[PDB]
RNA sequence: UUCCCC
RNA sequence: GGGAAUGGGAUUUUAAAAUCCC
RNA sequence: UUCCCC
RNA sequence: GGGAAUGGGAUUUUAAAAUCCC
């Protein structure tokens, strides 16, 4: 049929509108139509006191305009901008008394964890202009929606609500991305609610810097980014993805529960937003690591990457001098390069599948503790950023703590986390039971290089042959501070270091 | 429930200009990129022997003009958004608007682009004889 | 005369029973009733094929018998057995098409996390006996119950369900308590389900030991405790408490969400059980620690207490000897017991909440970093088992990690945990953001006692006089091992030690 | 839905004995502690001229006895639990049981405590005479 | 007839 | 309260209907 | 509203 | 085409209705 529910008249008046007042041809009264046109009848005066509610349901954002960005994006662009993902859900209420036939936004929830309750407000048609005003409404007729019953008396005016939305989005995303991606399940009512707080147009620039404009103010027609959006009320040019359009059957919870167990509490807007983002992250990221997609630097990724390599070199160089194992096993190394080339030890490499390394010396190993307990009975093992069920008692382990959230460590699926440094690594949930056979590694600095020279260093953790005397030179006094900062940065990023229980510093004091 | 008031062919542009900061610019950019104009306007039937003024209380079109209902030729009344008028009132609504026959394909765009002459009461460049 | 819904005849047969087959005077048909009595009509035969479902809803367990313990205990008594608390929730299905008017257990859930699905089974009065048999049933109407539709095709026989229940209860509770306390929200259907797997009687003893009998076996007519209940099929003499009787209004989710944000996902039996036990824990323990109630020493509590005492003494002595603070603030300790009496430092003592003593011995201190950061700039602050939002940069802190669950640490409310060591202490959720001004305390030993005195010690962390030589004497060599065992036990129990960032052991080495 | 069977005054003792491992011992202990007997049994209106046998197919009450329906004098039929018989069947259901009028206030307890002589069919100690 | 959303 | 959808092909007869197969 | 049978 | 069913309880008000819990 040649009708749509967009801009539907929900008023209870049995008659239509006058030809000089009806917005469309389907809105004019039947008494005026004649042979497909409308004829002015002096006997029917136009109405000057009517109020007609207009439905904002049924938007179609499929415009193709030359200088305008498109709101809906492809899945590859969403994978690129995963740092900007904010789940979004809306729970609504039904217009009841003076108008029936539309739903109004009641509780808007985001994956950040907030719920904003708004006064039921609609767009009514008056003889002068469309008026944005409060309308009578009732909660949906269902037991599942009974928790929405109090919220009808707890809403805020939309002027407050949209300013709070802009504040929350800017405070969440200003150190992560230059845009917002809304992760939706069903976009119809989400778009109907976005009509209340989202405006679009050509791409712009912030009024105080060179960043992309993300917010618009109607008090003064100015555009700003996340950093300069204080007092701004509208979201300008957002992006969105609909997850249900990825071939899903059933509802949101039935699909989320197949892959995750730490989120629940359906029909709450924030909880469903978290569920939507979790399902999207699972569908786009928990398969394998993709090195064809690269992410921009937003912080201390370079320092973390340097500090990890520095610690990995120093710990292994100290361990191979402490007890002098004749052979070691390196497990989980993507490429066949030993951490310390100068070591006089037999390196044997094992991995499930290397990162396309030409050196095929790496043996196949799909490790499991109950299966490979007798594989590495002798010699020190290395597990650097390798995630297994349990480590043996003779290992040196670096493990990332998924419970440490930061700009690099986004929330993940089923208790895991999405670590985005240069690529996106999905890490399963941290378990301390995997470290029952090990102990936490202490901090220490070690070097054998010759040295030549504001308080001088006074610490028992500087294991150097220079420190055997009563003083230490300035070269090691600076390099120890550099390694201390590197170790602090590495442990603050979320990395935990574990060593075998027999490890101690005294043997290192015997290396001189 | 309710009465449907819009045709599906208008679903795209009306969804566009409703979200746009500047609906008048958005409509012109939509037209300039190959989009079709707004349909489903109310068209009046008359003897075409009127005065020819731009906006009138009664249909008063000339021989080369067609009268439309004023609410259907205002873009903001179609998109149900804020009028940029000084008090938010509409000048077309409650009146009948005269569109030239050659421009009758896009009556919304004609009302957006063109203006009226305050001392003669008809469209500038499209029939006003004072210039 | 009034009637009760217990043992209601749910069968769809319109007539009553024969006077020789009716169990009560209400069951006999109106043919035979006369003048308040019954008549034997010679011609009427008795039915020999009827199958009358009997309703098990409406049990009242308010008996008072001398040798028989009561199932429903008071909350003052349940607080003393919090280590036996197991939340319990049942979902149900409606009998249909052969009997209407009763509900049968479908999904049984417990706070341990398990869900057990049973085939719909009922009690059917037959002309020979009562037959415990599978009956027709349907899931309840309503959207919220639609997830119960798949459970009708995956139930287990009840003889297996109660074996699994006994196994799970014994595995959970054999190292915690000598009984079970079921934490319920509505005890009606809970009792109706307990009819299927619970037996009562006088107090008994285990068949293989002198412990309280908690399980019964019909295959051998024997009683057992949690340790010896292999193959037992009934729970014998359990206890229970109804939380909704404590004055709550509304549903369980509404009251639970007022205090906790961790649990959700209502209408799944295990999740509802977890919510019920969480609400009970909040109502009993989040208020304040009750020192009047003591708990039995289940295991290793005295060793952990001695280890904590030794570690605290050593670290405070080492810090005071190394850095020589003028004032030490023993924050959160109402007692003026100095862990090192001979230290050349003055001591101040505070309490988080006002105690019963009105003397001027201690001062009030509700510490928060936003209000008390600059009040203790000089000296050192001893935050031993005191929980604050953020610690200052001059502190020695011992903090319990609530994510390390054990027999002494039970799950609590809103992410916290209930630690039971001679008393019940509810501790808020652990966050690593409270230690941004501190660093992890290294493991070390210090000796200040005289060195008057089998493998020689070769560790460099033993800060003692005899370590500056060929070998450590066997007195300190075994005392260091004892302290290492104490440290490992303490940090395995869940205690984390933090110190101000400028702590170094080298200042101790200059003491000799 | 459904037809009620029991009165509220039996709610406790029937809930107790339906949970016990030994329902006869439980009922005896409930009575010993001042509890009240199970009521709402099915008593017959008869001529009281019968042979006086303990269990019959017809109400055969002697002048010193009262006749009841059997299923109402069985604790296991009253609590809807398993019978302790090896076959699991009831000896009282489908029959009439004659209880002495001195012990007629608690017929359920009487049928538990007593037994029937085989050679005469009388309650032992109540109308039985074989020694 | 069926599904999704509220 | 809002909304969507009801597969593919062949043959015959007068775009539609019927039949048949998947 | 849902199911069974044809 | 034929047929069946739509759970349990508490409270209040005037058998019925409403509210609340499961
Ligand atoms: Mg939702
Ligand atoms: Mg439940
Ligand atoms: Zn800016
Ligand atoms: Zn999830
Ligand atoms: Zn040096
Ligand atoms: Zn207008
Ligand atoms: Zn003019
Ligand atoms: Zn035992
Ligand atoms: Zn909780
Ligand atoms: Zn010594
Ligand atoms: Zn019986
Ligand atoms: Zn005899």
Distance between the termini of chain B: 53 Å
Determine the structural class of chain B based on helices, strands and strand pairing.
Answer: alpha+beta
* Percentage beta strand of chain B: 5-15%
What is the number of helical segments of chain A per DSSP (H or I, 4+ residues)?
Answer: 8
Binding site for Zn(2+) 14 (chains A, C): 206, 209, 225, 228
Region (GpppA-binding) (chains A, C): 413-427
Catalytic activity (chains A, C): a 5'-end (5'-triphosphoguanosine)-ribonucleoside in mRNA + S-adenosyl-L-methionine = a 5'-end (N(7)-methyl 5'-triphosphoguanosine)-ribonucleoside in mRNA + S-adenosyl-L-homocysteine
Subunit structure (chains A, C): Interacts (via N-terminus) with DDX1. Interacts with nsp10.
Describe what this molecule looks like in 3D:
This is part of a larger assembly, with 2 copies of chain A (512 residues) and 2 copies of chain B (131 residues). Chain A has 512 residues and is of the alpha/beta class. Helices cover 19% and strands 22% of the residues of chain A. Chain A has helices spanning 75-80, 158-173, 187-194, 252-256, 269-285, 301-322, 474-492, 506-509, and strands spanning 6-9, 33-34, 37-38, 52-56, 85-95, 103-110, 115-117, 121-125, 130-134, 137-138, 181-184, 198-199, 215-217, 222-224, 234-236, 239-242, 327-331, 346-351, 363-364, 380-384, 395-400, 409-411, 417-420, 424-427, 439-440, 445-447, 462-464, 495-499. Chain A has a 7-stranded mixed β-sheet. Chain A starts with 5 loop residues before the first strand and ends with a helix. With 131 residues, chain B is of the alpha+beta class. Chain B has one domain (18-131). Chain B is 27% helix and 9% strand. Chain B contains 5 helices and 3 strands; from the N terminus they run ααββααβα. Chain B has a 3-stranded antiparallel β-sheet with strand order 1-3-2. Chain B is globular and about 40 Å long. Chains A and B meet through strand 1, strand 3 and strand 12 of A and helix 1, helix 2, helix 3 and helix 4 of B. One zinc ion (ZN) binds at residues 206, 208-209, 211, 224-225, 227-228 of chain A. Chain A binds 4 RNA strands through strand 5 and helix 3. Chains A, C: Mg(2+) 2 binds at residues 91, 267, 272. Chains A, C: It comes from Severe acute respiratory syndrome coronavirus 2 (2019-nCoV). Chains A, C: Zn(2+) 15 binds at residues 256, 260, 263, 278. Chains A, C: It catalyses: a 5'-end (5'-triphosphoguanosine)-ribonucleoside in mRNA + S-adenosyl-L-methionine = a 5'-end (N(7)-methyl 5'-triphosphoguanosine)-ribonucleoside in mRNA + S-adenosyl-L-homocysteine. Chains A, C: Interacts (via N-terminus) with DDX1. Interacts with nsp10.
């Amino acid at each position: 049929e040649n009708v749509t529910g967009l801009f539907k008249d929900c008023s209870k008046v049995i008659t239509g509108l006058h030809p000089t007042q009806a917005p469309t041809h389907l809105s004019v009264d039947t008494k005026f139509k004649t042979e497909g046109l409308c004829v002015d009848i002096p006997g029917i005066p136009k109405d000057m006191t009517y109020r007609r509610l207009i439905s904002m349901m049924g938007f179609k954002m499929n415009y193709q305009v030359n200088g305008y960005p498109n709101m809906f994006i492809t899945r590859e662009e969403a994978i690129r901008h995963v740092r900007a993902w904010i789940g979004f859900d809306v729970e609504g209420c039904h217009a009841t008394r003076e108008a029936v036939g539309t739903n109004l936004p009641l509780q808007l929830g985001f994956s950040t964890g907030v719920n904003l309750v708004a006064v039921p407000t609609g767009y009514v048609d008056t003889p002068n202009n469309t008026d944005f005003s409060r309308v009578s409404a009732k909660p949906p007729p269902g037991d599942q929606f009974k928790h929405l019953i109090p919220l009808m008396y707890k809403g805020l005016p939309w002027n407050v609500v949209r300013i709070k939305i802009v504040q929350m989005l800017s405070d969440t995303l200003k150190n992560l991305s230059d845009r917002v991606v809304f992760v939706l399940w069903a976009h119809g009512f989400a778009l109907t609610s976005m009509k209340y707080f989202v405006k679009i147009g050509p791409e712009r620039t912030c009024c105080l810097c060179d960043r992309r404009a993300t917010c618009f103010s109607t008090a003064s027609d100015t555009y700003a980014c996340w950093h300069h959006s204080i007092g701004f009320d509208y979201v300008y040019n957002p992006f969105m993805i609909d997850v249900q359009q990825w071939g899903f059957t059933g509802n949101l919870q039935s699909n989320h529960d197949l892959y995750c167990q730490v989120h629940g509490n359906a029909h709450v807007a924030s909880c469903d937003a978290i569920m939507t983002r979790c399902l999207a992250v699972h569908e786009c990221f928990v398969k394998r690591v993709d090195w064809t997609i690269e992410y921009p630097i937003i912080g201390d990724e370079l320092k973390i990457n340097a500090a990890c390599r520095k610690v990995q070199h120093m710990v292994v160089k100290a361990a191979l001098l402490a007890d002098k194992f004749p052979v070691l096993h390196d497990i989980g190394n993507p490429k066949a390069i030993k951490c310390v080339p100068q070591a006089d030890v037999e390196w044997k490499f094992y991995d499930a599948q290397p990162c396309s390394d030409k050196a095929y010396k790496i043996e196949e190993l799909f490790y499991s503790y109950a299966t490979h307990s007798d594989k590495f009975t002798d010699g020190v093992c290395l597990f650097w950023n390798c995630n297994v069920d349990r480590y043996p008692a003779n290992s040196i382990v670096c493990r990332f703590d998924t419970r440490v959230l930061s700009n690099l460590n986004l929330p993940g699926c089923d208790g895991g986390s999405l670590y985005v440094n240069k690529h996106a690594f999905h890490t399963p949930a941290f378990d301390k039971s995997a470290f029952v056979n090990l102990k936490q590694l202490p901090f220490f600095y070690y070097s054998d290089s010759p040295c030549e020279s504001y308080v001088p260093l006074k610490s028992a953790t500087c294991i150097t042959r220079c420190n055997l005397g009563g003083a230490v030179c300035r070269h090691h006094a600076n390099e120890y501070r550099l390694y201390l900062d590197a170790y602090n940065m590495m442990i603050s990023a979320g990395f935990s270091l574990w060593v075998y229980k027999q490890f101690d510093t005294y043997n290192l004091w015997n290396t001189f | 429930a309710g009465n449907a008031t819009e045709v599906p062919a208008n679903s795209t542009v009306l969804s566009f200009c409703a979200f746009a900061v500047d609906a008048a610019k958005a409509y012109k950019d939509y037209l300039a990129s190959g989009g079709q104009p707004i349909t489903n306007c109310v068209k009046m039937l008359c003897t075409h022997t009127g005065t020819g003024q731009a906006i009138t209380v009664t249909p008063e079109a000339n021989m080369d003009q067609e009268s439309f209902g004023g609410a259907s030729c205002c873009l903001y009344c179609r998109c149900h958004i804020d009028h940029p008028n000084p008090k938010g009132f509409c000048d077309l609504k409650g009146k009948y608007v005269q569109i030239p026959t050659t421009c009758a394909n896009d009556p919304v765009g004609f009302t957006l682009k063109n203006t009226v002459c305050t001392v003669c009461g008809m469209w500038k460049g499209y029939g006003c004889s004072c210039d």
